[PDB]
Design a protein around this nucleic acid. Structure first.
Ligand SMILES: [Mg+2]
Ligand SMILES: [Mg+2]
Ligand SMILES: [Mg+2]
Ligand SMILES: [Mg+2]
Ligand SMILES: [Mg+2]
Ligand SMILES: [Mg+2]
Ligand SMILES: [Mg+2]
Ligand SMILES: [Mg+2]
Ligand SMILES: [Mg+2]
Ligand SMILES: [Mg+2]
Ligand SMILES: [Mg+2]
Ligand SMILES: [Mg+2]
Ligand SMILES: [Mg+2]
Ligand SMILES: [Mg+2]
Ligand SMILES: [Mg+2]
Ligand SMILES: [Mg+2]
Lengths: 152, 31, 65, 60, 394, 106
RNA sequence: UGGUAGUAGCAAAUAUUCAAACGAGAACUUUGAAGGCCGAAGUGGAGAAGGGUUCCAUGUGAACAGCAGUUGAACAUGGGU
RNA sequence: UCCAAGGUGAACAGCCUCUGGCAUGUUAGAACAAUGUAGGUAAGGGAAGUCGGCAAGUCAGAUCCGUAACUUCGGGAUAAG
RNA sequence: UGAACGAGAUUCCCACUGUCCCUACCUACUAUCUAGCGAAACCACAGCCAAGGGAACGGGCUUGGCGGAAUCAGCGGGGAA
């Protein structure tokens, strides 16, 4: 494998990625942008608060049709949701990253998410049935996720 | 056996055609 | 865990329907090991499989009118 | 200030309706509860909550 | 192409846009014209809509079919406890309009008035006006305050007064009072500032602002009805029953050209909760709150010269959805804007009241105190117990 | 004094006001669960099966107006849940609800 | 492969709830209890034509079953007329 | 195609229950805005609506009475009231 | 010509009724919000107007009016959709 944005200094950073994750890309991309630059103790608490509808995920780019919540004031935004599946798949990856930092001997209490990107995995194919004997696509939008954690 | 996904759905996928062949009077007065 | 087999065998053993079969909720592990009709006939003697009585449809109202 | 034709209760200047039959009799009703019962030919002395009942049965 | 049968439009374009009022307390957008001849007086007062009832009075207009006859007129009860003056503001008239020049607050400001200065009063240190009140005691602050009072008398042409309600005297959940500038229309600026200075941290009753038989204006926000369709928002004709894709709409929202929906076309949106100002609301009675006269609290603000019944303005079971009116209240003819317990800003009329109806002296003969929480049929509690006699609960 | 037990009178009639017929009984058992969290500040509320029969005694749309319930905050002592406490809500069958204050049970 | 768009939509046939069990994981599985529906021209019990192993047991939870699934007419291994 | 319980009732109608079966029909939670789809009521007037009584409503079972114009003598006819 | 008959066309009357005067309110499912899931038509570029000229009805050119992120629920004027 090869990550984008190789860290400024190895042996002080840990990596953790995932391929073909059955999570919505548009929901996961906006969730990864909320934890960009966050401390992992703050990011793990934030992602758990998203699954409990305590802190919202501000939908900056893919905000067409999404509602407007009161928790979006904290992000200087209007549209925000609480993607539960996106936050759970990032918690499993952020936990695997902490496992990669404890094996390398890194200080887990000072890790900062310096880089995290969400790509598009190949779309899985399902079909739906429409009117007048027509069949339209019912594809899924998976996502490749990768992240690098550094000490600050 | 490490190809479970495609070997299980090979019997369930059906080929489809590229293009699906599917199946006002308009005359005003005062001529 | 899933006792659909024992719920079905106890219907043909007790000669009743599935709605009249009562499996012991505190003895689900012993019932789960009963995979044959001989073991189902063994549990109906142990009191673990009880045939519930018929729902009361009283004709006392009809016999009075 | 008048009295209800059915319930016998006291009517105040801004309450109830007034019903004037075709034969020249004018009745005062406290509310639509007493008005609908009057139009239903209900006998007041058979209605437990009226004044004519409490006088007939000496409930006062 | 013209409409064959003429018909007026379905609304007034002068109340646009039909949006939610950005404020909750009504705003006096125009005070009465200042006249230096009349004595010094306030021209506004905050009230709270308690509820409605009806009265009985003898009309005295010569030449009417209702002359010398008893009438049942709907009235609204607006509980108006006295307001505390805690500020003076001077305005200088500039070519760009009036401008706030100086603002002198009182030395002592109650906690219910400071609640307006906060959004989370419970978790906030009560620090508002803590460093400002020290100016009334420091010799440097006194001299600076004296320069500010002299600046109003010399440079300002419109002197207003900041006052707030006393929500401790209301049965409402809200403890945060409502602040408001009340313009002084008395006389010279030197007298208006001196009069307002001696009125700092002092209560002002509604009996001093308004009087009996006075046409006043009622400002405030209407009852919010939420998102409403055009049939209810603009009162348009309902399309026939067989109308496909809905019948409670406006059929044509505009011609082909202009190729744009016009602002005059009636559209669906938010109805209610609009800022309004209804004028010519005659004061029928200025009631007095509960006050101990000679050791016993008197509750007789609903008795007339012809009734003499010892009863309060509150009906049986109190005003529904509001509470108990235990303070001074106003009695306006008809209905006023807003829901129950809605803060209303009473204002003197901008017009000269000289009509036959404006000068008509009203003399109440009977005020209805029957329970409004159902079909009330008794005025007082003792009248109900004397009519029904003893019950099982005895 | 974590382990405590009291008896309340949950006024269901004012907690299901305006609820559809097919949703009154389930909402009644959701307000009882909410009543056990506001009074006993502890999640993971366990409603006794005898109480489920009481609120469902008169069908799904006719729920008893008031009900006598006993809240008893107990300790898990077996599971590793982040609560470490749970409130068992039992049904107290009473005939009259007049004058029934909130009392403590030992 | 895009914008559309995380949008239309996942709205015919009254209705679910409580506790427990298994399990990393339960609005959906299983057991128990309660509340309901089909109301014998049934949402019951058996055939014909057609289907062709869909039947049964165990196991898997990857793809499918348009949410989920510890479940399945899915998949895997045996059995059965 | 085959078998077809109790009550109500003239009824294999409608409605309720028992045997048997099921989990509300390819998802759930919260809220109860507009506009919809489906259901219902509305004072006073009673087709003034509209191409048009469209839609809705009125009537309804049984018992005792009373039943014309016209007619091919059968009917009309559950006339109507 | 014509009894009887007609999911046939038509006129009037009675009765009835929110068809209407004149709308209102209530209920169920939607819409709405959230979790999961997730399309399609369509698309030169695109999207505020007035006037002028012009292939004689501009969105773009001309002269003016002027123009402030990202969006939600609606809406049916326009895109000669
Ligand atoms: Mg087809
Ligand atoms: Mg108060
Ligand atoms: Mg149509
Ligand atoms: Mg009332
Ligand atoms: Mg099987
Ligand atoms: Mg199997
Ligand atoms: Mg699925
Ligand atoms: Mg197979
Ligand atoms: Mg349903
Ligand atoms: Mg009517
Ligand atoms: Mg006509
Ligand atoms: Mg019809
Ligand atoms: Mg005839
Ligand atoms: Mg026909
Ligand atoms: Mg164009
Ligand atoms: Mg076209």
């Amino acid at each position: 494998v090869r990550y984008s944005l190789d860290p400024e200094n190895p042996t002080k950073s840990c990596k953790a990625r995932g391929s073909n994750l059955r999570v919505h890309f548009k929901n996961t991309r906006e969730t990864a942008q909320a934890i960009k630059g966050m401390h992992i103790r703050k990011a793990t608490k934030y992602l758990k608060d998203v699954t409990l509808k305590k802190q919202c995920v501000p939908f900056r780019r893919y905000n067409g049709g999404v509602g407007r919540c009161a928790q979006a004031k904290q992000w200087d935004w209007t549209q925000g949701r609480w993607p539960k599946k996106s936050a759970n798949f990032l918690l499993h990856m952020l936990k695997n990253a902490e496992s990669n930092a404890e094996v390398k001997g890194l200080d887990v209490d000072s890790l900062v998410i310096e880089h995290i990107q969400v790509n598009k995995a190949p779309k899985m194919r399902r079909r739906t049935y429409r009117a007048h004997g027509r069949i339209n696509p019912y594809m899924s939008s998976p996502c490749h996720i990768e992240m690098i954690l550094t000490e600050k | 056996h490490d190809f479970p996904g495609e070997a299980a759905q090979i019997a369930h996928q059906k080929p489809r055609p590229t293009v699906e062949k599917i199946i006002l009077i308009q005359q005003p007065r005062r001529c | 865990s899933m006792l659909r087999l024992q719920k079905r065998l106890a219907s043909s053993v007790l000669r009743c329907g599935k709605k009249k079969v009562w499996l012991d909720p505190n003895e689900t592990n012993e019932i789960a090991n009963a995979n044959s009709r001989q073991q189902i006939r063994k549990l109906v003697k142990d009191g673990l499989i009880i045939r519930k009585p018929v729902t009361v449809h009283s004709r006392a109202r009809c016999r009075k009118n | 200030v008048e009295l209800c034709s059915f319930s016998g209760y006291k009517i105040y200047p801004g309450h109830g309706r007034r019903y004037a039959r075709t034969d020249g009799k004018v009745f005062q009703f406290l509310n639509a509860k007493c008005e609908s019962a009057f139009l239903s030919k209900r006998n007041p002395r058979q209605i437990n909550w009226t004044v004519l009942y409490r006088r007939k049965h000496k409930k006062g | 192409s013209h409409r064959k049968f003429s018909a007026p439009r379905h609304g007034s374009l002068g109340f646009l846009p039909r949006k939610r009022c950005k404020r909750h307390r009504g705003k006096v957008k125009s005070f009465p014209k200042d006249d230096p001849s009349k004595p010094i007086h306030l021209t506004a007062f905050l009230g709270y809509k308690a509820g409605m009832t009806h009265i009985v009075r003898e009309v005295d207009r010569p030449g009417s079919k209702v002359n010398k006859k008893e009438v049942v007129e709907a009235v609204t009860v607006v509980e108006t406890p006295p307001m505390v003056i805690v500020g003076i503001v001077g305005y200088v008239q500039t070519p760009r309009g009036l401008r706030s020049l100086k603002t002198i607050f009182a030395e002592h400001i109650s906690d219910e008035c400071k609640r307006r200065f906060y959004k989370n009063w419970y978790k906030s240190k009560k620090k508002a006006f803590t460093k400002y009140c020290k100016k009334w005691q420091d010799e440097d602050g006194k001299k600076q305050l004296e320069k500010d009072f002299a600046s109003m008398k010399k440079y300002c042409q419109v002197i207003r007064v900041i006052a707030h309600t006393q929500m401790r005297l209301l049965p409402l959940r809200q403890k945060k009072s409502h602040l408001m500038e009340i313009q002084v229309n008395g006389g010279t600026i030197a007298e208006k500032v001196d009069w307002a200075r001696e009125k700092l941290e002092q209560q002002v009753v509604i009996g001093g602002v308004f009087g009996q038989d006075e046409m006043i204006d009622v400002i405030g926000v209407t009852k919010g009805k939420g998102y409403k369709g055009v049939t209810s928002r603009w009162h348009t004709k309902k399309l026939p029953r067989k109308t496909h894709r809905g019948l409670r709409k406006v059929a044509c929202i505009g011609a082909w050209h202009p190729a744009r929906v016009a602002f005059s076309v009636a559209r669906a949106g938010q109805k209610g909760y609009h800022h309004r100002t209804e004028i010519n609301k005659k004061i029928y009675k200025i009631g007095q709150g509960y006050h101990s006269k000679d050791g016993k609290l008197v509750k007789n603000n609903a008795s007339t010269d012809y009734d003499l019944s010892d009863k309060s303005i509150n009906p049986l079971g109190g005003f529904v959805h509001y509470g108990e009116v235990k303070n001074d209240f106003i009695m306006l003819k008809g209905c006023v804007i807003g829901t129950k317990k809605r803060v209303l800003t009473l204002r003197k009329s901008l017009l000269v009241q000289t009509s036959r109806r404006a000068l008509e002296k009203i003399d109440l003969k009977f005020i209805d105190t029957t329970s409004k929480f159902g079909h009330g049929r008794f005025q007082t509690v003792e009248e109900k117990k004397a009519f029904m006699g003893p019950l099982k609960k005895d | 004094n974590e382990v405590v037990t009291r008896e309340y009178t949950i006024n269901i009639h004012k907690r299901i006001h305006g609820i559809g017929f097919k949703k009154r009984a389930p909402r009644a058992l959701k307000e009882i669960r909410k009543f056990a969290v506001k009074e006993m500040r502890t999640p993971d509320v366990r409603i006794d099966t005898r109480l489920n029969k009481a609120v469902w005694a008169k069908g799904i749309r006719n729920v008893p107006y008031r009900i006598r319930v006993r809240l008893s905050r107990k300790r898990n002592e077996d599971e590793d849940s982040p609560n470490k406490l749970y409130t068992l809500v039992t049904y107290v069958p009473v005939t009259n609800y007049k004058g029934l204050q909130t009392v403590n049970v030992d």
